[PDB]
Amino acid sequence: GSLTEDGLSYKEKFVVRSYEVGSNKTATVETIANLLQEVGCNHAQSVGFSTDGFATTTTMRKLHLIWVTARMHIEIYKYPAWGDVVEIETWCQSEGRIGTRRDWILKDSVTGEVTGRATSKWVMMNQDTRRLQKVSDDVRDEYLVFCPQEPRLAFPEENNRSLKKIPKLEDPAQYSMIGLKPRRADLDMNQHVNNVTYIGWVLESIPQEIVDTHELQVITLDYRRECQQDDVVDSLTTTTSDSQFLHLLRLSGDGQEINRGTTLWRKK
Amino acid sequence: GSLTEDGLSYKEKFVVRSYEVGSNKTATVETIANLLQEVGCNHAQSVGFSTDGFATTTTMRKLHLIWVTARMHIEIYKYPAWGDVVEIETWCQSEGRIGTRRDWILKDSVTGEVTGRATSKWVMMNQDTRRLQKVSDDVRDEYLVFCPQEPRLAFPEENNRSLKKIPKLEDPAQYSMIGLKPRRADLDMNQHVNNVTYIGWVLESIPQEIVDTHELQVITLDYRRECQQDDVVDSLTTTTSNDSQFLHLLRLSGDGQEINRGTTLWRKK
Numbered sequence: 001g002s003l004t005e006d007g008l009s010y011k012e013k014f015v016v017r018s019y020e021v022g023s024n025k026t027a028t029v030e031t032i033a034n035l036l037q038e039v040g041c042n043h044a045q046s047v048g049f050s051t052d053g054f055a056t057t058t059t060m061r062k063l064h065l066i067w068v069t070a071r072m073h074i075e076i077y078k079y080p081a082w083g084d085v086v087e088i089e090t091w092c093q094s095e096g097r098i099g100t101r102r103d104w105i106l107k108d109s110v111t112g113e114v115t116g117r118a119t120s121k122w123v124m125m126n127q128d129t130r131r132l133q134k135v136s137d138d139v140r141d142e143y144l145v146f147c148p149q150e151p152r153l154a155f156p157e158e159n160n161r162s163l164k165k166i167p168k169l170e171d172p173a174q175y176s177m178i179g180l181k182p183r184r185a186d187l188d189m190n191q192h193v194n195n196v197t198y199i200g201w202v203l204e205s206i207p208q209e210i211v212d213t214h215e216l217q218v219i220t221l222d223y224r225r226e227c228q229q230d231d232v233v234d235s236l237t238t239t240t241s242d243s244q245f246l247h248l249l250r251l252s253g254d255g256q257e258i259n260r261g262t263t264l265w266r267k268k
Numbered sequence: 269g270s271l272t273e274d275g276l277s278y279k280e281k282f283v284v285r286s287y288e289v290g291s292n293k294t295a296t297v298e299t300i301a302n303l304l305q306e307v308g309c310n311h312a313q314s315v316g317f318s319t320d321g322f323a324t325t326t327t328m329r330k331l332h333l334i335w336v337t338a339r340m341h342i343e344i345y346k347y348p349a350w351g352d353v354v355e356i357e358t359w360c361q362s363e364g365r366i367g368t369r370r371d372w373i374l375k376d377s378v379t380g381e382v383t384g385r386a387t388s389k390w391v392m393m394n395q396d397t398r399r400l401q402k403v404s405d406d407v408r409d410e411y412l413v414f415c416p417q418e419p420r421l422a423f424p425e426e427n428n429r430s431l432k433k434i435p436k437l438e439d440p441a442q443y444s445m446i447g448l449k450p451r452r453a454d455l456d457m458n459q460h461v462n463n464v465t466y467i468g469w470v471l472e473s474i475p476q477e478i479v480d481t482h483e484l485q486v487i488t489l490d491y492r493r494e495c496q497q498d499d500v501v502d503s504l505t506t507t508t509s510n511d512s513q514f515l516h517l518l519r520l521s522g523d524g525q526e527i528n529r530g531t532t533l534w535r536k537k
C-alpha cells in the first residue's frame with residue numbers, strides 16, 4: 001500500500017484468500033483483524049517506527065517502553081468474499097496522556113462503499129515490569145507529526161459502542177470452551193500470543209447454532225492480561241439479550257482474568 | 269496470478285505479511301503450506317474446476333467424488349522475510365489410476381533463485397462413505413488436457429525423499445504434545461480441519477531447543493485419517509538421527525487411532 005497525499009493516513013488493498021474464509025464463503029472476523037494488524041504495521045514502517053507490533057521510537061527503545069492494545073472494537077456490515085478486493089485506510093490519533101488510538105475504515109474496492117470499521121486503544125508500558133506509563137513529553141512530539149491535528153474518528157457517534165464499560169461475567173456461564181492452548185502458529189515474531197488469537201478464543205464458546213444462523217456484526221474486546229505460551233485458557237459466554245453476549249477469558253487454573261468482551265450478531 | 273503461456277501451469281506472487289512470520293523474522297512452513305494451497309485453488313479456478321479444495325468436475329460432483337491429500341512433501345532452502353515477494357509455480361500430473369500429483373516451485377522474485385519446492389499425492393474418494401477408488405477414464409480425460417504430457421517433476425531425483433515409506437513410531441515417544449484441539453480458525457469453508465493444521469500439530473511436539481537452534485529443511489507428511497471438529501489429538505516425536513531427523517505420529521487422544529505419520533529434517537542455523 002501507500003501513505004495518502006497528506007501523509008497523515010495509510011491505504012492498502014487485499015485480495016481475500018481461499019484459506020481466509022469461513023462456512024459462508026466470506027472472510028472471518030479473525031481474517032479481518034489480521035489484515036488491520038498488517039496495514040497498521042505497514043503504516044508504522046512507512047514513517048520509520050518499529051515493526052515488531054510495538055511501533056516504538058529510538059527513545060522508547062532505550063527506556064524499554066512498548067505500545068500494547070488495551071481495547072479493540074470492530075463493526076462489520078459486509079464480509080468480503082474470497083477473490084474480492086478490500087481496501088483498508090488507517091490512521092493514528094493522540095488521546096493525551098492516556099495513550100494512542102488507531103482507527104480503520106474497510107471498503108469494497110469495486111463499489112467504494114464502507115463495509116466495516118474498527119477502532120483500538122493503545123497504552124504505553126514497560127516491556128519488562130509490565131507496568132503502565134502516561135505518554136511522556138518527548139515521546140508524544142515524536143509521533144504527533146504523523147497524526148491528523150483535527151479529530152478524525154472511525155466511530156464519531158457522541159458516546160457509542162466502543163466507549164462503554166464491559167461488566168464481569170458471573171458464574172455459572174451459559175456456554176464455555178475449556179482447555180484452550182496456543183500453538184506455535186498463534187505466536188508472533190517476539191514469541192508472544194497474537195492479539196487475534198484472543199478474538200478466536202472468545203468466539204470458541206459461542207454455540208454452533210448461533211454461528212450457523214447469525215453473522216457477527218460487532219465485537220468489543222478488553223485486553224487485561226496476556227496469556228503466556230504455556231498458559232491454558234477457559235472461554236465463557238452468556239446471552240445478555242439481534243443476539244448479544246457477554247464474554248470472559250480466564251486462566252484455566254486460578255481463574256485469573258485475561259480478557260472480557262461483548263458481541264452482537266444479526267440473523268442471516 | 270495467471271496461467272503460463274502454454275496454459276499447463278499457474279504462477280502467483282505473494283508478499284510475506286507481518287502475521288505470517290516466526291521468531292527468525294521469516295515465513296513459517298505453515299505460511300508456505302497455506303500459500304501453496306491458495307495458488308492450487310487459483311489454478312483450479314482458472315480452468316473451471318471446483319474451488320472448495322476438492323477440485324471436482326461435474327462428473328465427480330454427480331458421483332459424490334472428491335480429491336483428498338494422501339501425502340505432502342516440502343523442502344525449503346530459504347524462508348522469505350516479511351515484505352519479500354515469493355513467486356510460486358504449480359502444475360498437476362496424472363499418476364495413472366492411483367491418483368494425481370500437484371507440484372510446486374518457490375522462487376525469490378528479485379533474484380529468481382529456487383528457494384523451495386513441494387510435491388503432493390492426491391487420491392480420489394467418495395465424500396460420504398470415505399472409500400477410495402481408482403480414477404476412471406471418464407474422470408481422467410476431463411483433467412488431462414490441463415496437465416503437461418511429458419513428466420514434469422519438482423523432485424526428479426533417482427531415489428528422492430518424497431517416495432520413501434514412513435514407519436510407525438513406537439511407544440514410548442521421546443517428546444509429546446497432548447490434548448490438541450482444532451478451533452473455528454482451523455476449519456475450512458466446508459467445516460473440515462485444514463490440512464496445514466496437521467503440519468502445525470506435528471511440529472508442536474518438536475522440543476523448543478531445536479526450534480531455537482535449527483531451521484526446518486524437509487517435512488514429509490502422510491494423511492491416514494481426518495480429525496473431526498470435536499476430536500482431540502496427541503502429537504508424538506522421536507529423534508531418529510550436523511543435521512537432526514525426527515519420526516512423528518498424530519493419533520486420537522482416546523483410542524490412539526492414527527491420523528498422521530511423518531518425518532522432519534532440520535539444519536543448524
Ligand SMILES: Nc1cnc2ccccc2c1
Nearest residue numbers: 028029030203215216452
Ligand atoms: N460470523 C463470523 C465471522 N467470523 C468469525 C470468526 C471466528 C469465529 C466465528 C466467526 C463468525
Ligand SMILES: Nc1cnc2ccccc2c1
Nearest residue numbers: 043044055092100143146
Ligand atoms: N503513536 C504512534 C505509533 N505509530 C504510528 C504509526 C504511524 C503513524 C502514527 C503513529 C503514531
Ligand SMILES: Nc1cnc2ccccc2c1
Nearest residue numbers: 184296297298471483484
Ligand atoms: N523452522 C521452522 C519453520 N516453520 C515452522 C512452523 C511451525 C512450527 C515450527 C517451525 C519451524
Ligand SMILES: Nc1cnc2ccccc2c1
Nearest residue numbers: 311312323360368411414
Ligand atoms: N486432477 C486435477 C485437478 N485440478 C486441476 C487443476 C488445474 C490443472 C489440472 C488439474 C488436475
